[model samples]
Target: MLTEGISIQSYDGHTFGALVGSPAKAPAPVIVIAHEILGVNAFMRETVSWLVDQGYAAVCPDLHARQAPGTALDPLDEAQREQAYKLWQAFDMEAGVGDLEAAIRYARHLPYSNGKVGLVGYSLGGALAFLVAAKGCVDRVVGYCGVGLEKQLDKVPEVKHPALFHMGGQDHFVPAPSRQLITEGFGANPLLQVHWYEGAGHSFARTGSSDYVASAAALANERTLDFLAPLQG
Candidate 1:
């Protein structure tokens, strides 16, 4: 896998930091990693590399660049958690989604890309992935416990591409009401698929985290890859 740090210019002219990982083969599919509120830290970086190893070009954008430029703070650190919360409070969801759209444009034009771009986002990123899917730019999207999705149920019908949502049963951030909203809103949509991991909570797929569940994450990975195989060239 080949890796590099890149910069993306948002629709509003703000510069966002992004890490790109590409497989050795050209004309491969692209996976844009919409990072959690903590930004494009180690976990997100590792995720990009892993996607490249799976034969796809992965791009992880720093959605918190406006408040924490070039910052990759450890979410586990107390002081950093405070900073993360502040950044989260200051986050501009509309502008962040615009930045992701810009990243998708960049990915499509990459010499290594096959022009099929998929999105996988965690936490806040997951909701943004769902948001972008509504705009119909990406080919596919997978959302991991998409936080704040309950508020966006009215827009679910606008998503035109294939979408997979991985929900953790115990996630306080996405409790019963949100899950029910997701189910009732998306259940009849042939383009949307939802998978639940009963015993898991928020960040269940986050490797090395206290909430990380090996079995759940592994199964999510298997399901995600299966969902993407037919969509990629």
Candidate 2:
């Protein structure tokens, strides 16, 4: 597998960069990784590589490119928390959906891609994943600890494709109350699945992060690979 960078234009005319990882063959399924609050960081790029190892071409969009193109942060740097927070406040998370839509379009047309695209997201990325699925263009969607999803429950019914969600039971961003609301709102959809990881916290699957949990993380990976496999299956 090999990895590289590419640029795509959003619907609104701004262009952004995305990191892409490709398997050694053509016409393969593609998975788009929506980035976290830190943009297309090391974690997200490594995810693209791992997905390529799984036999799919993967792309990670610069979700914050409108505000700061090609920005990335150190996941281990606690000091970067302030910068992440500032970036979040200065940008509209929902507005990034246009760029994600553009990324999806770009993924479909990629020479290596089989015209099938799946989207997976972490944290704020997860929220956008859910939101983008509601736009009804993507083939599959998976979200881990998607923030503000409780408030977007109304959009759930509009998603006609497959979707899966993994959340930490102890996640502060998705507290028990919010989780319950999400379950109540999203559980009834036969096209979607919600799984809970007991005692896990936010970023549980983020390898090398302080919050990473091996058991929970691997389980989510196992399930996510299966969930996304439908794109290739």
Candidate 3:
């Protein structure tokens, strides 16, 4: 896991924290990761590091810096968990999107970056990826069980880039209605692909969790690599 922490400022002057991962080489394609509601915790960092190992420059930005700065608390920390939830409840998507965009821009201009930027987001970040793609800022996007996308179904049509969405059939946060909307909205788009894991639940790709499904995660990673292959150059 080749990684280092960095600081980035949004267009609105909010200073956000981020982790940049690289293979210690120059001019590599970049992947911007949007963290879950809890924050840019171990799961996010590890993912970025793994991407770096895959020969891509990866950046994971702390979108909750405005409310909960730094890495997230322990998953079992009840007190901090409550705080995380509150912060999530009050999250400002506009500002969060700005942070994500800024992160992408930072990665784009990095000395080692090839100027191509793709987005990979999970949970809350997944939803924001959809929003950011709609705004036409990134080259490609991959979202996993994106929550709250149903509320912004109107914007799906705006995402004309090559995009992929993964759905967990039993995801409580992203129930049937949300799935229906995403399916019907992006299903027919030539640039989009949606995959569903019937046996997986929320965070199925999150390792070390009861909800984690190895087979599903493995296939998802394979598909993700396939989707990112042409864009990684």
Candidate 4:
């Protein structure tokens, strides 16, 4: 497999960081990795490696590049935490969706990528992934602990791609009511599936988080890969 770092030429004159990884077996489908609230840390990169292992050409972009490319996994300092939150608020979901689409365009042009796209996201990236799917760009989306916004639900009729939402039952950020509303809005779609982790909380899929649950995380990944396989080229 081959992996290389590259910069994206965004329509909005922004440069996003990305990795183009190709598996040795064949030209795998392109999967875009959207990062969690902590930004694209080591855990997110590890996710890229896992995708490559699964025979997928993975491209993980630094969604929070305005803040910094590399930050700590678990930052304890007050300044870091403050900066993290600031970047979180500053992150433009629409811009992020554009950036992700640009990444797909770039990856599909490469010979190693099959020109088909799938999506997987954690937290903030999870939400954006759903937006990408809703916007009708990619084939499918797998979101881990994605805090679905009401605004997103308001635009559900516009969503054309399939989605599998991994929700934590105990997550405070994403309340049950919100999940229910999102489901109800798109439940009629045969391709939409929302799985709730009975007793898990936010970040249960991330190993570095306090709420990380090994069993739930493993199950989610298995289901996600299965969901993306058929649609991938």
Candidate 5:
């Protein structure tokens, strides 16, 4: 029951754990972090800390609570990768999105909240962020290496919120064709911003990981910070 821990209950009344961290001041904007397939691991915690430092409160929910609660699998471990993929297969993405939706609902009312809610997601969570932004509840949204997003383009036409998505051109998860498809699919959306780092691969922004490409991640992060600057007010 730490102040930084958020308890989130789904529409079905199933309660799950979400980590929360806020800035020194009260009433700041909140950002719900949608985690990658590996669940709310060290990466997500690091992200939350980063967001908090940027003057926004962050709530990162355990997306796999129902099946594999408190998952913290390491991406560099082959065994963990297998386990993560297995959990990913069992994961109900819609249910995960609902969880994030609930987080947004909860964040707006946090004692330290400034009443604005946004989302920033990574990998699998990237697609989830895209899906949720279309629902129009959030003020801003961002995604990094959004895996499998092309398959979910049907929701693009409904997105009206400000969204910025970053893609790594060398990502094996999203090939050239898929990138082209994603680009063309959202071609007409003025509010959605898509950026590609030509030489970077998946998880390039994930510091401490092998795929972290400093130059690309720095540029994307700079852009993200600029895009999210409005949220701080």
Candidate 6:
């Protein structure tokens, strides 16, 4: 219920946006909520708030700030959605990751924070979360329907953080075989934990998506927190 604003001033310069929850004063366990191809929208904010409700300060950065030429949007058409996706791609993962790193640093420096942080990304955000943890930025990481692990197999085993992946068996955009490849490649990494839900599809937690399966999404969220709880400093 506590709403506030957040930004990575040092990163991408003067980029200011809202963070919709109380990031506990001293720095409790923090979770960086990354957006899907839709950018930071209502669902993402709601998710952040939900995490806050769980007693963890959720930090969300508006990654599409420079891409679409406007504030976040709630599109109602195919053309609009396509434009949104284009804007998201232009946001660029490198810069986005920098923004996330800045957020982590900010969280770590907070008085209430224990200096431990985790990431929860959906779709594009998921891939970015993987990149962040792969670089060893946060304490732990979680991704939903994430892509790009195929190119990261070599580095997968090098990640010391406890990273988790929540993928769906019905995710058409990211096939089962591709998920298998990632699972196999990262299996050697003792710190990585992977879970695949059979009936869900991409964006399974999204209410608007046809593939959304509430039970699975709920379970995944709980599991992610359990994974992060032990690592919280």
Q: Which tens-of-lDDT digit does each residue in 16-98 have in candidate 3?
A: 77877874577788999988877877788788878888778888887888876785755667887787788888999999899
Q: Rank the candidates by lDDT, best first.
A: 5, 2, 1, 3, 4, 6
* TM-scores, one per candidate: 0.95, 0.95, 0.93, 0.90, 0.95, 0.88
Q: Model 5 has how many clashing residue pairs?
A: 1
**Candidate 2 C-alpha lDDT tens digits along 21-99:** 8765776898889888887887887898889888899888887877777678886777777788889888786578888
Model 2 C-alpha RMSD to native: 1.9
Computed on alpha carbons, the lDDT of every model, listed in order, comes to 0.85, 0.85, 0.83, 0.76, 0.86, 0.74
Clashing residue pairs in candidate 2 (N, C-alpha, C atoms within 3 angstroms): none
Per-residue lDDT tens digits for candidate 1, residues 1-233, read 11345778888888877888876688799988998877778888888878887889888887877776766779789998788788888888898889899989988888888879999988888889889988889999998988888788787789888999898999998788878887888887789888989999998999978999999999998999889887567
Candidate 5 displacement at residue 63 in angstroms: 0.4
lDDT of 6 by residue, 1-233 (tens): 11344455646574645464665453567777877777667777788878776667777776666554224556556886887777765667787788778777776665666667778888888888888878897888898888666777777856878889898878886686788788788788888888888888877877677778999888888898788677454
Error of 6 at 126 (Å): 0.3
Q: How does residue 54 of candidate 5 score in lDDT?
A: 81
Judge candidate 2 at residue 130 and give its lDDT. 91
Counted clashes in each candidate structure: 0, 0, 0, 0, 1, 6
What's the CA error at residue 222 for candidate 1, in Å?
Answer: 0.8
lDDT: which candidate is best?
Answer: 5
CA shift of 17, model 1, Å: 1.9
Who is ahead in lDDT, 1 or 6? 1
**TM-score, candidate number 5:** 0.95
Q: Distance (Å) between predicted and true CA of 67, model 1?
A: 1.8
Which residue pairs of candidate 1 clash? none
